[model samples]
Target: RTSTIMTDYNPNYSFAGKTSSISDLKEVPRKNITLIRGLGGEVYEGQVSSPLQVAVKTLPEVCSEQDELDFLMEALIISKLNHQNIVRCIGVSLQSLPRFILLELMAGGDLKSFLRETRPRPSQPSSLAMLDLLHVARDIACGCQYLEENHFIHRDIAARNCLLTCPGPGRVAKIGDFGMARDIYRCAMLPVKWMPPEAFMEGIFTSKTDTWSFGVLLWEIFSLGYMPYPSKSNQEVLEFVTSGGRMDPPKNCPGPVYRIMTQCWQHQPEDRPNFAIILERIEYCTQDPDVINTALPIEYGPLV
Candidate 1:
């Protein structure tokens, strides 16, 4: 069974109530007050009287018709994607004034935060740690493979959108945040930085676009949380990416890992390696101890 909850943006509707089952949660808003601020939305952490925690993402009110349409489209798309590496959508609250999407609580947070704080300080991992990253890479590849094979394009496949389940022995990475995703066959255009030149200039996107984004994500992993095109403006990043100026992984990155990233960012979308190839390469690298080293180049200088 399920429960339903509805609420307006106004504080008047902020009261909490209890229900029987999942069906009963259908339109009902849980009154729990745990709040977490995010880049563009608010996350509320709550429990259903049990130990299980739930995360509710409340988006600001729709400012325009296109914004509302995009929200609904993303919700529909996310609800349909089923995979262990993809976050599960518990329910939605469209009746709320601002609207919200309910997702499973990921105790370990997003990949970006994980890399910045939890990853080893030296940026090189031990054999066991390398295996951990390999697991994450494999899960990300699986999600991307599913997207490409099913004809869905996740326009934004960055570390910020990759969520982690509980860490330790049973840890797993799950891809989340599909606000910019689209059906490959349906989308005519995409953002320039994330889109291949052919797609940005001619409005044609394919599985190759996803591969390019994956390359950027791999760079993020190697850099230990550095944003791509760090000091460059959007226009600059677009121009650079369009001109085949792909980011080179940090000098510390393993050779095989670097090669995989290089192949992913090939100028021509068709020229880039597919997710299957990427997954295989990463797995191979994880098995070689000598490839994972302690001494590797990182930042050029001290922070300004």
Candidate 2:
């Protein structure tokens, strides 16, 4: 006889209680600044009350049902998360079409653009020091730790998906973009370049796999936003990774930081350090005088 009892029947997807009336979200006047443009849609600046600012994200004016479902799933996942390192999902507006996911407005915008713009250029010197990037990396690791503890795997953990809460020194960074995130306790074209060998060979993805992506993200920060494995095509990246190949250390990347990257890129998932350990190592790096303030070389490889 077949058992009729439901297995782990928790309705975790219910986020209706967090919905807000879109009419209440006031758009800032003529503010054309696009905070972030990710796989889902664009995020704009707005305010819920005169004293409180927020990020207003909406789906494409015209999108597929699949896109809408993915967005709703993203909203559901973020709604249940609470951490200073992760973007806070205030609420959602599904009262009408072009639904919105209200988020905490991050003033500094995404980390990828910030790194690219601040990299030392022929016209100007870098506005940020290497220590700043380490702090950013630590903040992201904290976010990853939270996700790992909660059994949430953020498949996409790149500089592009990280947001700086402010623009200057002591700036805080938070992980954003849940489009590729899922609760394994429940659930992509995959980000091939960032995928670990287990993922490429066995189609397996877990919190450990996310660690591998985190390694690539560290490369991005140290490289000042250059593409990971810049000269290789996506297919080449796949082949190289499966063949026990790893990208060379980016120019001027501090030795300690590169060690952390290598740990994250371990071929066996079990060999990789958990985000908690990774966070600890990064925190220690910040205190080590030898590597704490190491700056990226003013002259490096191609930007793109």
lDDT of 1 by residue, 1-304 (tens): 1212211211111111211221233444544333453533477765533444667777566355545545544555666677878998776666555666677888878888886665553343321254566678778889998877776667778888898886564679889887665333112334454556676677666788788888778777777677777787677877887876877666467778878888888877778888888888887887778665434343343232
Q: 275 in model 1: Cα distance from truth in Å? A: 1.5
Deviation (Å) of 135 in candidate 1:
2.3
At residue 128, candidate 1 shows an lDDT of 28
TM-score of candidate 1 to 2 decimals: 0.76
lDDT for 183 (candidate 1): 35
lDDT measured at residue 4 in model 1 versus the true structure, 0 to 100: 25
Instruction: Report every candidate's CA lDDT.
Output: 0.66, 0.75
**Cα error of candidate 2 at position 169, Å:** 2.2
lDDT of 2 at 288: 88
- The candidate maximizing TM-score is 2
Off by over 4 Å in 2: 1-40, 122-126, 182-189, 299-304
Estimate the Cα RMSD of every predicted model relative to the unseen true structure.
7.8, 7.5
